[PDB]
Amino acid sequence: GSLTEDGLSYKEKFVVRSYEVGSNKTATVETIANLLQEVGCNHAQSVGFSATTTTMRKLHLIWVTARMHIEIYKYPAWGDVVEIETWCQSEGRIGTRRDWILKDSVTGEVTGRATSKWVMMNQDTRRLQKVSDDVRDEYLVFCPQEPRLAFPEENNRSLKKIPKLEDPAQYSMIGLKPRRADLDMNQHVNNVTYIGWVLESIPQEIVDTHELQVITLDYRRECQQDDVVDSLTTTTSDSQFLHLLRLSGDGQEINRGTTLWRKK
Amino acid sequence: GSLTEDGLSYKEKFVVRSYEVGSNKTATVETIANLLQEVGCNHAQSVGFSATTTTMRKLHLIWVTARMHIEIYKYPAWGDVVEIETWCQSEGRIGTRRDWILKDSVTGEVTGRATSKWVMMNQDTRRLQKVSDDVRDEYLVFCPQEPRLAFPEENNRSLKKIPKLEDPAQYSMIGLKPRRADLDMNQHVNNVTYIGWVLESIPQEIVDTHELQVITLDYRRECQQDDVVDSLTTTTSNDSQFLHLLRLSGDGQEINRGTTLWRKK
Numbered sequence A: 001g002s003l004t005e006d007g008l009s010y011k012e013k014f015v016v017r018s019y020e021v022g023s024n025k026t027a028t029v030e031t032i033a034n035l036l037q038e039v040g041c042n043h044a045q046s047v048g049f050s051a052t053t054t055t056m057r058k059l060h061l062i063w064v065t066a067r068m069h070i071e072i073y074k075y076p077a078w079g080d081v082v083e084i085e086t087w088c089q090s091e092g093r094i095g096t097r098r099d100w101i102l103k104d105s106v107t108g109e110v111t112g113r114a115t116s117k118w119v120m121m122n123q124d125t126r127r128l129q130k131v132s133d134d135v136r137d138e139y140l141v142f143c144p145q146e147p148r149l150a151f152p153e154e155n156n157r158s159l160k161k162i163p164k165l166e167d168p169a170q171y172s173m174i175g176l177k178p179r180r181a182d183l184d185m186n187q188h189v190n191n192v193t194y195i196g197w198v199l200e201s202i203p204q205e206i207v208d209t210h211e212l213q214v215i216t217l218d219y220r221r222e223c224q225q226d227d228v229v230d231s232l233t234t235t236t237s238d239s240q241f242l243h244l245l246r247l248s249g250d251g252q253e254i255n256r257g258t259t260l261w262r263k264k
Numbered sequence B: 001g002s003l004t005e006d007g008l009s010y011k012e013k014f015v016v017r018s019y020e021v022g023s024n025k026t027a028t029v030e031t032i033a034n035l036l037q038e039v040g041c042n043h044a045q046s047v048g049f050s051a052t053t054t055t056m057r058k059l060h061l062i063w064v065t066a067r068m069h070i071e072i073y074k075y076p077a078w079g080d081v082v083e084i085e086t087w088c089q090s091e092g093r094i095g096t097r098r099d100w101i102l103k104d105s106v107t108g109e110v111t112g113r114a115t116s117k118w119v120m121m122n123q124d125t126r127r128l129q130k131v132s133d134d135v136r137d138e139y140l141v142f143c144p145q146e147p148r149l150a151f152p153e154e155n156n157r158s159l160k161k162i163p164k165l166e167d168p169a170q171y172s173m174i175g176l177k178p179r180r181a182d183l184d185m186n187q188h189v190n191n192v193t194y195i196g197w198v199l200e201s202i203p204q205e206i207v208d209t210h211e212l213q214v215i216t217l218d219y220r221r222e223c224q225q226d227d228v229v230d231s232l233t234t235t236t237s238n239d240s241q242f243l244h245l246l247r248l249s250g251d252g253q254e255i256n257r258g259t260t261l262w263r264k265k
């Protein structure tokens, strides 16, 4: 992978692995999300980060995901090369945004796109807070100045309000717990695991006859290593579902989302 | 990746990914096992397969893992390039063997090694069988003729008999279930998931102060997509050894048994 000519975006090629594909012999949405995260990490490393900036390290601040939105037109097959371009942009004092474009390396055609909203948080107290002047200044030298959006459309899917699922849920998968492979290098549950947990409550017949086209996920609270999660789904409709992840015990909400599936 | 000059082994380079590493910023044993599987699949593909031979597809036969043995000296760090060499060998009518050597691409030094035993099974009835002459002939053209072993030693730990853990277990992790990411392209639980499940019953303090040096795992029965597993561990021992058992939560049906050896950091 490498930064592009202007140094304002980053590109990387990936060959799809045997264990990375599902029943269709194409990359799962969890493999796609892992590839987005990997290209995002390689971009941060190439521009001097050791995700945190120098000012963030002094104030004990970290970037946390608030929203992830992914749209896939074609899933790459096992053995195929996918090229991913990523860039980041400041959104005033609200937070930051990271976008991606997925392309088939052979045809050069756009096969997917993604956008994510990130908010600033004190790592110890877990208190949100807004973006300061000092942080925006040392971030803007690595971001395009004019707006560059993976989802430019006025009033688009990536910026829609998501309602809270009402009990009873149509479908559910209960007692979901993270294992050590679900944790990152800081022993926190990886963001991609929540996508998998959301999808666990979709029935196997929908998965067998449909392909996931769009997934929008809001992150409300982090799931600890010793937490247990219940995954809830209701059909709202192509097939659309409304999703809710909550702690098995007290019912504390960890995520809410929507998925849109196309018939094969 | 590519077949070596003689066409009797296969090499591939991997750059270790951010999500592939643990608390030490080095590749987990599950990432290593996924890389072994990937290089093994790329080797089978490069020599004409899709690892069923021509006769195996006619007779509804598949290769299934009976044993996996992995020894790691150094885990590659995030961003490092690891080179893996793999080859297969016939073991008479018992089955086949697949071996691996892991090397640091920069220094060329051996950082790990692995060996695995595979048996032939009818896909439909699940009945294990000996290897026929016709199948043995079809895959011997892709294997070295002289023995080539990743674990050549006379008293190597890769061929040791593993006892059955006796209840009560010292440690346990209960109610483990596979999710869709744990399944392969044929909707069967991936072999690497069982390694993760075995390790789930090791206490977090052992993981925090030790590094896994050796893992030997026997596969007795497959875990179905809707099965629930219990992971059991007992200390048997500067080095710590554990005896492991995976069994179905309900009836206690054994799916795996294993041993791990950990060294102090």
Ligand SMILES: Cc1csc(NC(=O)C2CCOCC2)n1
Binding pocket: A033, A034, A036, A037, A038, A040, A041, A044, A051, A065, A068, A098, A116, A191, A192
């Ligand atoms: C160091 C760094 C910067 S961005 C990042 N992670 C991502 O972008 C992921 C998060 C969730 O999975 C998809 C994208 N890590």
Ligand SMILES: Cc1csc(NC(=O)C2CCOCC2)n1
Binding pocket: B033, B034, B036, B037, B038, B040, B041, B042, B044, B045, B051, B068, B098, B116, B191, B192
């Ligand atoms: C095509 C083919 C033949 S065997 C194989 N994979 C392995 O060897 C893996 C199995 C899981 O444990 C790591 C090694 N792929």
